[PDB]
Each structure stands twice: as C-alpha cells, then as structure tokens.
Amino acid sequence: SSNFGAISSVLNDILSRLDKCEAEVQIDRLITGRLQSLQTYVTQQLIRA
Amino acid sequence: TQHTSSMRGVYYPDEIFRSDTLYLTQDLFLPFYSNVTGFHNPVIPFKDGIYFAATEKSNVVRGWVFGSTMNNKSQSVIIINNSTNVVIRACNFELNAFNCTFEYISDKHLREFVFKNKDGFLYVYKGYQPIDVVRDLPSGFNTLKPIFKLPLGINITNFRAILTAAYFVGYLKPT
Amino acid sequence: SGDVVRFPNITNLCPFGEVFNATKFPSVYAWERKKISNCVADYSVLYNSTFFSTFKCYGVSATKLNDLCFSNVYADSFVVKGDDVRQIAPCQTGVIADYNYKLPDDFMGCVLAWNTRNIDATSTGNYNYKYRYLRHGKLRPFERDISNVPFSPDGKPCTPPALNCYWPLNDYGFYTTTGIGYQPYRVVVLSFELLNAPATVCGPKLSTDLIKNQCVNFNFNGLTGTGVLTPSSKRFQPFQQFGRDV
Amino acid sequence: VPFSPDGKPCTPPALNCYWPLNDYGFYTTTGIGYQPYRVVVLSFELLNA
Amino acid sequence: TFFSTFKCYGVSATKLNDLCFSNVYADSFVVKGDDVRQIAPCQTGVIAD
Amino acid sequence: SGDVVRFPNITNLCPFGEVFNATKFPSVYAWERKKISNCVADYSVLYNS
Ligand SMILES: *[C@@H]1O[C@H](CO)[C@@H](O[C@@H]2O[C@H](CO)[C@@H](O)[C@H](O)[C@H]2NC(C)=O)[C@H](O)[C@H]1NC(C)=O
Ligand SMILES: *[C@@H]1O[C@H](CO)[C@@H](O)[C@H](O)[C@H]1NC(C)=O
Ligand SMILES: *[C@@H]1O[C@H](CO)[C@@H](O)[C@H](O)[C@H]1NC(C)=O
Ligand SMILES: *[C@@H]1O[C@H](CO)[C@@H](O)[C@H](O)[C@H]1NC(C)=O
Ligand SMILES: *[C@@H]1O[C@H](CO)[C@@H](O)[C@H](O)[C@H]1NC(C)=O
Ligand SMILES: *[C@@H]1O[C@H](CO)[C@@H](O)[C@H](O)[C@H]1NC(C)=O
Ligand SMILES: *[C@@H]1O[C@H](CO)[C@@H](O)[C@H](O)[C@H]1NC(C)=O
C-alpha cells in the first residue's frame, strides 16, 4: 500500500492516466521499492531458518 | 469565560474514502482538552479555522459573516438561514451589495461547526447533539460530517456571528 | 482476451461554445470561475475553430483524456499578454503569479491558452484589461483581490494626488502592430479531481457489454485493469464507485 | 473521400457531408504563431550493421 | 538556415559530431507556427492525430 | 514555534537601472562581464518597467 514517492500506490492508477512516456519513471519507482521489500523479507527468513 | 473542549470537534481531514483502517495524520485539528472562549457580537479573529459551537434552545444564532476588513472595500461572505432556507452570498457588503460573484439558494440543542479555508475553498462541516440544560460545553465525542465546500477565493481573517443562548469559539492548530 | 468499457449515461456536449467563444473575458486580476458538470468533454470539435498556442496538463496526460473520467471540473478564465502565459503554471514567480493568479503546487488539471489578436486588439488600442502590480505581500493559491484602494509603501492610507501614493492597477495596452510578446492571449485553466464520488463529465468512449468469468481488460469510469468479472454480494455506500483491500 | 459522421458515403452538396481537408492560409502580416514553418524529422538507428 | 526548433530525442545534440549512425531517414513537411509543438513523441492535437 | 530571520546590514538597491536600462549592450561575440556587490536584490521593482 506504499507508493515509494510515486503519484499513487495503485499500479492500475498510474497506467490509467499517464501515457507511455511519463509512466516509465513512475512505474520504475514502484518496482524498485517492491523488489527491495521482497528482498528484505527473504533475508529475514534466511536468518530465521 | 473560558471553558474546555474535551474530545470534541473531530472532522474528516480529507475526502478520500477509507474503511477498516487506522490513519495517522498530521493536520489542522482542535486539540483535546483545549481552551474555548465562551460568549453569553465582537469581531472574532479567524486564525487557521474555527470550531464554532452553539448551545441554543429557541434558534437565536443564524448564520455568519466572514471577511477581511468588514468594509465595502473587500469581499465578504454571509451564510445565514432566514427561517426558511439557507442562502450564501459573497459580495462587497456594507457591514448595498455590488461587484459580486457567488450565490447559492438551497431548499436544549447543540449545533457544532468547523470552518476551514484552504486552496480557495471554504469547507464547512456540521454536527448535531441533543444536549441537556447546562451552562457549559459538555464532555463527549461527536464526529462532524462534511456538508459543503464553497469556491470562494478570498482571504478570511475575521468573522462575526449573526443573532436575532451562548456560543463557544476555538481555534484549530496543526497536530 | 476481451474488452469491457462501461461509462455513465451522459450525452450532452460540454459548453465549448460558451467558455471558449465569448464576447469578453475578464481581466487577470478578476479571473472568473465556472463549474462544468454533466457533459461529454470532447476536445476534438475544436480542431476547426480554436487553435491552441499552449495546452499542457499536470497530473494527467493529454493523450489519456479520452479514456479517463472525472468527478467535477472547474474552469478559470482570464486574459494575459504574450510572454505572461509562461507564468500560468505551478511553482512560478513573477507579476501574475505573485499579485494576480496563483496555482497550487500540487495542481492537477490542464492549462490551455490561445492567441486572440483579431478580437481583443484594436488599431487605436484596447486599454480595458488590467493587472495588479503593487500589493502588500503575495497571494495564497486560488485567491483573488478585486479591491482598488491606493497603495503607499509605508502602509498608511493616502490620496493619489499626493506623493508616494499610487494606483495599483496598470492597463494592458494592446495594438494590432506588435509582436506576439505583447499580443493578447486568452487563458483557461481546468481543475479535475478524480475522487470516489460518482462521475459527471467525461470523454467519448463507446460502451461494451459485460463479459463475465473470462480474463478480460475492463475500463470502469477510467479504471483500467485486468481480471475476471463475477456477480457480487457486497454492500456499498450510495456514493461509492470501488472498494479496495489491505 | 468526403466525410460523414454516421459512416456512410455521401455527396458534399448534401447535409452532414464534409471535405476533410482545410487550407492553411498564410499571409505576410500575421504573428509568429500563424507563419509558415518547415519541419524535417531525422530518424537514426545505431545498429551493429 | 537558422533553426527555431532543434531538439534531439534519445541522443544529445552536442554528441552528434563523434557519433556514427547506420541509416538515417528524413521526413519533410510544412506546418504553421503553433503546430511545431505537436511534432513530439506522446503528443495530441490535430497534427499528431 | 518561533521565527528567527537574520540578514546582514545591507540597504542599497542593486543597479537595476544601470544594468537592464543602458543605451547600448555589447555584441554577443564581445559580451561584457560586471561584478555586483553590497546591495539588496529586490527583483520586484522591475514589474513596472
Ligand atoms: C487578507 O487580509 C489581511 C488583512 O487585510 C492581509 O493581512 C495583511 O498582510 C500584510 C502582509 O505584509 C501586512 O502588511 C498587513 O498589515 C496585514 N493586514 C493587517 C490588517 O494586519 C492578508 O495578507 C490577506 N491575505 C492574503 C493572502 O494576502
Ligand atoms: C485555559 O487557559 C488557561 C490559560 O489562561 C489555562 O491555564 C487552562 O489550563 C486552560 N484550560 C484547560 C482546561 O486547560
Ligand atoms: C461604501 O463605499 C462608498 C464608496 O466609496 C463610501 O463612500 C462609503 O463610506 C462606504 N461605506 C462605509 C460604511 O464605509
Ligand atoms: C430568504 O432569502 C431568500 C433569498 O432572497 C428568499 O428567496 C426567501 O424568500 C427568504 N425567506 C424569507 C422567509 O424571507
Ligand atoms: C467594481 O466596481 C467598480 C465600480 O466603478 C467597477 O468600475 C469595477 O469594474 C468593478 N470590478 C469588478 C471586479 O467587478
Ligand atoms: C469548419 O470550418 C469551416 C470554416 O468556417 C466551415 O465552413 C465548415 O463547415 C466547418 N466544418 C465543420 C464540420 O464544422
Ligand atoms: C509605474 O510606471 C508608470 C508609467 O511610467 C508611472 O507613471 C508610475 O509612476 C510608475 N510607478 C512606480 C511605483 O514606479
């Protein structure tokens, strides 16, 4: 539910009102944040294991 | 005679629908257990938004006037209720009317309001409660629903009630 | 594999003939605000009549204004000169942004301005449109100050016959023999919201029948998505258009 | 071909039938915004060829 | 020839002297003054539609 | 809760009269450089001229 500095946290809200030229930088801020959140989860799970 | 406002005057800080959540927000609110000034009609200041509570039994208070200088050199909005329907007019009144834009005609007790002016919009929130006979603002907790926002692009820095009871005024602070 | 497009029952066209083609726009210091509701914002019937020098949208994209659907739209109209069109923007300073008309930092809308020298300019001069150039402090966003009291730098009232007393409104002097930098321009600023309330004004997209239990691309009031559609037993508020999760 | 909003052929003597080509009317006494401009668009590739 | 507009996408105009292309296509036409802004990627109007 | 603004003891207004209003500027190939010191840069007295 976090947006990581983008206009909104919903990926179907950026693609609904931004063209293919402006939405490249807004999507690529959500992908990086969600990737690092998943990586933090995997590191914590490895230490717990 | 100053009184306290205990857990009173909680409005909706935005217009986003959200349910079954917990929201931690930083906004202009009336702080809990804060001072309120009670009047049993001076030109009261309007610092950042007000909580205006009217404890009335025979409809003494009716409407407000908001302005900058309360002259005919500045825009001023009146929101009164002439016993039938509510009228809203923003003109250069002589506190006749000229050079003016907005107009809107729409068709013991405690009536409590929150007025907030931001981004050229005057937000008015309203709440109601069946008080018993007192001489003080009672404790409790009543949330305030949003009734209407007006596109009045003016500075509001003074206000003044319009009478034909008592009323309490408190100022909003960023908390 | 599929497309589902659902839009409300709106058929009226928005008043492009009364907001863009009017006999006189107001001055910049007394800009006029008008509400637009319950119509179909086409933007394609203007290709034959009105040619736009500036058309820039903030918070949305201009190519996506046909399949996006708004809640309420406000139009602010006024007249500036040629090189003051660059100050009708967020995050800007100057004489129009300070003392006449200020846009919010988090503005979401469209600024559109076009040149009118055939109707707003006269051979002898059109000294009707005025702007304010003296004021005690700047303006909060989306405010206006149509007062005409004389100005004194110390902060006391005076008579403009006396010294250090000035009238605070200058006249735009428009001619027919001057470059674009001092030629009249009509400006319209449109403000959108896109809330959860039911929609009033939006663009010309044809509707398609509902396809259920299939992986489709749907479009409900400008909400692009992908997924299967099933009948629901949920309970909404009377004003709600969608619901979300944790 | 002449244009008709319903999507059927028509003759432009009739009604709701238009020729879909306007003429640019260029004069020597008009501002910069309605003066002729020549445009050249250059496309590069930068391949391994 | 004095250029009123000279904007390069995907490359930089200062780097067109030490850069070497594979094939270049030139598309030429004439527009009016305030339609030069519609020759851009991700644009709308009457020239771009 | 409080505001503290401290600025040096400068009261002169910068030469907006001698910089922006001169009888001639140099050509672009022989551009002129001038130093500005010890004044208050208003930028708001130019709204009239
Ligand atoms: C709305 O009106 C008030 C009062 O007229 C304005 O407050 C003035 O602000 C200037 C700023 O320097 C002061 O010099 C004046 O002394 C203030 N007035 C008074 C009576 O003290 C206020 O600025 C106006 N709102 C806006 C947005 O300009
Ligand atoms: C009201 O204000 C006074 C200051 O004069 C303060 O001492 C008092 O605590 C306030 N009331 C409450 C309930 O806090
Ligand atoms: C209303 O405006 C007029 C016009 O200047 C003025 O003469 C009059 O004094 C104003 N009213 C008040 C109450 O000042
Ligand atoms: C209240 O004011 C409105 C606005 O002029 C008017 O139409 C209405 O008749 C008034 N009602 C009474 C009872 O005066
Ligand atoms: C305000 O009233 C005066 C009266 O002479 C008029 O000249 C002026 O145009 C008016 N301004 C607005 C913004 O209505
Ligand atoms: C376009 O404009 C021309 C010039 O006024 C007019 O003759 C023609 O009918 C217009 N076409 C449409 C479809 O409005
Ligand atoms: C602004 O310019 C006008 C035109 O020259 C002049 O009459 C007026 O005195 C100027 N005002 C100030 C405050 O310089």
What descriptive keywords fit this protein?
part of a larger assembly; 6 chains; 49 residues; mainly alpha; 0% strand; binds a molecule of 2 linked components (NAG-NAG); binds 2-acetamido-2-deoxy-beta-D-glucopyranose; Spike protein S2' (chain A)
Task: Explain this structure.
The structure is cut from a larger assembly and holds six copies of chain A. By secondary structure, chain A is an all-alpha fold. Chain A has two helices and no strands. The first copy, chain A, has helices spanning 11-17, 23-48. The longest helix of chain A is centred in the last third of the chain and has 26 residues, at 23-48. The first copy, chain A, is elongated. In chain A, 10% of the residues are buried. The interface between D and E is medium-sized, with 20 and 21 residues. β1 of chain D pairs antiparallel with β1 (25-31) of chain E, so a sheet runs across the interface. The structure holds a molecule of 2 linked components (NAG-NAG) and 2-acetamido-2-deoxy-beta-D-glucopyranose (6 copies).
Q: What spatial form of chain A do the alpha-carbon principal axes imply?
A: elongated
The number of helical elements of chain A comes to: 2
Helix percent band of chain A: 55-70%
The whole-angstrom Rg of chain A is 14 Å
User: How large is the share of residues in beta strands of chain A?
Assistant: under 5%
Q: Largest interface by residue count?
A: D-E, 20 and 21 residues
The overall strand count of chain A is 0
Bound molecules: a molecule of 2 linked components (NAG-NAG), 2-acetamido-2-deoxy-beta-D-glucopyranose
Q: Which structural class best describes the helix and strand composition of chain A?
A: mainly alpha
Q: What string, H for helix and E for strand, traces the elements of chain A in order?
A: HH
Question: Largest sheet of chain A at a glance?
Answer: none
* Separation of the first and last Cα atoms of chain A: 27 Å
Instruction: Characterize the quaternary organization of these chains.
Output: part of a larger assembly
Glycosylation sites (chain F): 9, 21, 48
Organism (chain F): Severe acute respiratory syndrome coronavirus
Disulfide bonds (chain F): 14-39
Protein name (chain F): Spike protein S1
